[PDB]
Write a protein that binds this ligand. Structure first.
Ligand SMILES: Nc1ccc([C@@H]2N[C@H](CO)[C@@H](O)[C@H]2O)cc1
Ligand SMILES: Nc1ccc([C@@H]2N[C@H](CO)[C@@H](O)[C@H]2O)cc1
Ligand SMILES: Nc1ccc([C@@H]2N[C@H](CO)[C@@H](O)[C@H]2O)cc1
Ligand SMILES: Nc1ccc([C@@H]2N[C@H](CO)[C@@H](O)[C@H]2O)cc1
Ligand SMILES: [Ca+2]
Ligand SMILES: [Ca+2]
Ligand SMILES: [Ca+2]
Ligand SMILES: [Ca+2]
Lengths: 313, 313, 313, 313
């Protein structure tokens, strides 16, 4: 029912976002496009094929996009997602799903221009390089897109730096382009995603689904959990990306606040920060909004329900 | 018992900080030094004499300091404190208290070098210009000062801009100097001070003290209240400065968190922000700390108690 | 013999660069692509059609490109080239030359990928937005391009600001992208172009060609001259753009120095400056080089010779 | 006849500036104050005593100043002036000249406030830290000072970086303070000082003076020459500092241009650059001017003449 384009950089959590987008009956996945981020474009694209195979996805093109940030030098997060970007999974000899011939930037422009206006929503869960290129190359897509729901940012938290979130800092100028176009933007930041904890009970409910995709998720969630407990301290791992897809499925999974948000491009300490203006006489008629509280039970409900529907292909 | 130097820029709330510092039996006021900020150095200095007269202070030198920020152009806040900086009070023909001969920067260096090590705590409630100059002119004072407790900043709130607080933004390089010296710094920021609301009950308890200093405070608190309800929206006015003195009197009036804090000097959107790093594996052995929650009843208790002791000189 | 793609923003001097590129027998013009700059993309594209008509060009596609800088806000130079961007010329009811269907960015990628390696040289004489987009969208073109010869910058002079040249400052990030790719870049900056003065003798030699294209050039050169004598003071006008094409025709028209050049993105006073490092132990194996001295007679010789060959179509 | 305060950081060339200031009959040296720069404050101060002793100076106070830049971290040039800062000279067991008790910042303010207006000219040949502190601590000195003639900067050359000169970059905010006060500033930059070469003929004329001060200069000039020929390539060494004193003695030793000059504080490539605006409709009524061409013979004449007058004390 809801057509989306999932632009991601398959690392541990992006994989869960793909499973959720596939398994849920409310989402119609038009394409999976990749960008540099968690790992280099090549690795990330190979990972998208791997999970698309595991979940038995067919009829959905997987197109690679930009292999470098717009202006800045490449910066990846291999210390979180392993060298492969997919933690510790072994790849098949051959993938059933092949990388499309078109450049993700062209495919996105193609899909948006060929479909009826306001029917596609973009869901970026990686750096915003491909979305910004597309918006600049064919500005007509900004008024046709239904809305953009991205995982990135943090109005009061950061991870890459004390105040900046990874997806935004790896390409601040692309983020600046996206947040400043007139389309509707929902920022599902760390403020929210730090609530999407994969606790023991949840992992247990997952193990009980007892299917191949489920054993896969259990395996990567395990690796992800080991990293978070050590590296960037938390009792459990936060699985960010699925939260951006969950909001498209059912907006009631989270509360949102409508506030102005811009991107810092020159600060020495604040480079890459999503600056939100919460001072009250609030704007009214503001094209951006941030996510605040997550309905933990409903969120995990949607994931498990998706895992069950995918079954064992 | 606790010797302090109060460096301020007498506007509405700085006045209350002076009354509290004078009236409380726990504080020994060595000097009141002034800086540009709420108004121009001249106005602010005249204001410090006015309240020093009203509270009947004697034996305490009032020394003017820097009339301009270290590098940036002058920026004042006359729209909040009126043209006089002291809102709407009429000045006497002659002041009993006279402005000292020495420059505040020299007086501060003098007091610190002549007293025993670790016995004086600096309490800046204005721009940090004089403190920075002093520390650069005689670096020996940083190891002798007991600690610095300033009113300024905001780890998650701002007023001058969406993320920056007035005292820090009027002279970012001075703030950068102060936060980076090795002395202990307690930042009593907007996060805390926005809790020190002067509500009707409080103003009523004040009117009942029925003394001249009290009528004075009631008068300025009134003007301050009119501005906050209009200009920078809030139901009541937040009286910031006294909070910095209250912490010196009794540290239990507020909770504090020990985290790294630095000042942004080049950001376009974030100039002057006090960037705090709350990401956990927290530092341990960190010379800065921010104030979080205020004990509202104890705070106002201290103020009224001081108003009563000052009496009617 | 020398295949080029002229990327420009038709204003007064870009027009002369087109005439020279068309009339000279050494240049083979594959396409004329436009960008925002002197005027808005629409105006500039209409202007390119106007001069293509006047010079009787046929068989050469004119494709429009980016209508906005990559990240910054649009900035034009209508005070130098008039509102139309073409000073004071009247446009025809219909143009014989039509704007191509393809986006300049796609056309450039097309031409370069379809021709033999190292046979096309890019000649940008406007902001660098289209060249940067193309290099990011299809990175394979940077190794296939023969070299890039652009009019822009100034190692010791500026015009838009005290140290920055218009073409670079209207899109600093695009310029940063171009100067940092590994292809060979020849910067024909203001240091050189300020020598290409259109003095009375030259204008007289032009009037004598007595053809339509020549009367056209005479007309616009006139307006250009009036502006330079008033606005940005000089005895005569400097016609910048043709110098970039002249270097492709005969490199001996100017001397060049091989030195490192980078673009300043964050300076307050120096935004957009082309910083060149002339300190000696010079690099050796440096992909950029700046133009220094112009052979004035040979330069104008090439222009007049081209005007004569175009004749009167 | 011309009273000056020489603020310097005795390294090889600062020493020659002291000899020239002492030996020339036109200069009346009120004091020699030191700052961090070529070496740490301690070393540089010890060096000033060494040369004051060798030249037999008496009746002139030597006062130390700031040991750190205003905001940035300390940066010295020991690779040019050796570890001692004075290249390779051995120090005496005891110095006849003792370091004054007052801080240079206070001494400078003292001298200027106690003498008649417009009779003292400041001659900084090191980082501008002390001059900026003094102008901020007592703003009354800027209108009393006759003018400031400093060695530093470069409108078209740099040494520390491709576009910035050492003295300015070690403390950009101090420089920004000095160039922005209303006093007259003459900038004797690298553009000029690179002409003051100490060629074999000159060194020979010096050896012939055959006195102790002369043998000293010959010794340090030798070391300085070895460094310049290797490190920062040039056929001979450029002795910068004396050029600033020569201009005070006889302004005709060099040509100057009156143009606006400001300091870049945020650029990534251009930090510390003295940006001069040579675009013409030149200001008229401009408090800054840069030095252009040096009268080589007259310059070295003044130095040798001073060496002869000092004789052999
Ligand atoms: N430590 C860490 C670094 C990168 C990411 C990625 N960036 C976003 C959260 O910062 C998500 O899209 C996630 O894939 C997550 C954890
Ligand atoms: N709007 C407003 C502006 C300035 C201040 C001053 N700055 C600090 C709070 O921002 C306090 O010291 C206070 O005196 C308070 C209100
Ligand atoms: N004043 C002025 C402004 C813009 C330009 C354009 N920019 C470059 C020179 O700055 C050329 O390409 C020219 O078309 C020329 C004059
Ligand atoms: N390489 C080098 C570095 C520092 C200096 C000092 N800085 C100024 C020239 O840059 C002079 O005052 C000189 O003392 C000279 C040479
Ligand atoms: Ca991701
Ligand atoms: Ca205050
Ligand atoms: Ca042009
Ligand atoms: Ca020096």
């Amino acid at each position: 029912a809801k057509k989306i384009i999932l632009d991601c950089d398959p690392g541990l959590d992006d994989a869960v976002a793909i499973l959720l987008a596939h398994g849920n009956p409310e989402i119609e996945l038009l394409a999976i496009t990749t960008v540099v981020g968690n790992q280099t474009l090549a690795k990330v694209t190979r990972n998208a094929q791997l999970v698309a195979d595991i979940a038995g996805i067919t009829g959905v093109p997987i197109a690679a996009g930009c292999d470098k940030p717009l202006v800045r030098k490449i910066m990846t997060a291999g210390h979180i997602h392993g060298e492969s970007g997919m933690g510790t999974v072994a790849y098949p000899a051959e993938f059933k799903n092949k990388v499309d011939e078109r450049h993700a930037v062209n495919l996105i422009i193609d899909l948006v221009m060929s479909h009826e206006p306001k029917t596609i929503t973009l869901v970026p869960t990686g750096g915003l390089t491909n979305i910004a290129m597309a918006a600049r190359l064919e500005p007509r897509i900004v008024d046709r897109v239904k809305e953009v729901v991205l995982m990135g940012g943090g109005y009061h938290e950061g991870n890459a730096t004390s105040v900046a979130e990874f997806n935004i800092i790896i390409d601040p100028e692309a983020a600046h382009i996206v947040f400043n176009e007139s389309w509707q933007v929902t920022m599902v930041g760390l403020d929210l995603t730090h609530q999407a904890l994969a606790t023991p009970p949840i992992l247990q409910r997952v193990k009980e689904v007892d299917t191949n995709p489920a054993r896969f998720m259990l395996e990567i969630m395990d690796y992800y959990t080991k990293i978070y407990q050590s590296n960037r301290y938390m009792a459990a791992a936060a699985v960010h990306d699925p939260c951006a897809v969950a909001y498209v499925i059912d907006p009631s999974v989270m509360t949102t606040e409508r506030v102005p948000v811009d991107i810092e491009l020159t600060g020495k300490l604040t480079l890459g920060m999503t600056v939100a203006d919460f001072r009250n006489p609030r704007p009214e008629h503001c094209h951006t909004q941030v996510a605040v509280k997550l309905d933990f039970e409903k969120f995990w409900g949607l994931v498990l329900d998706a895992l069950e529907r995918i079954g064992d292909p």
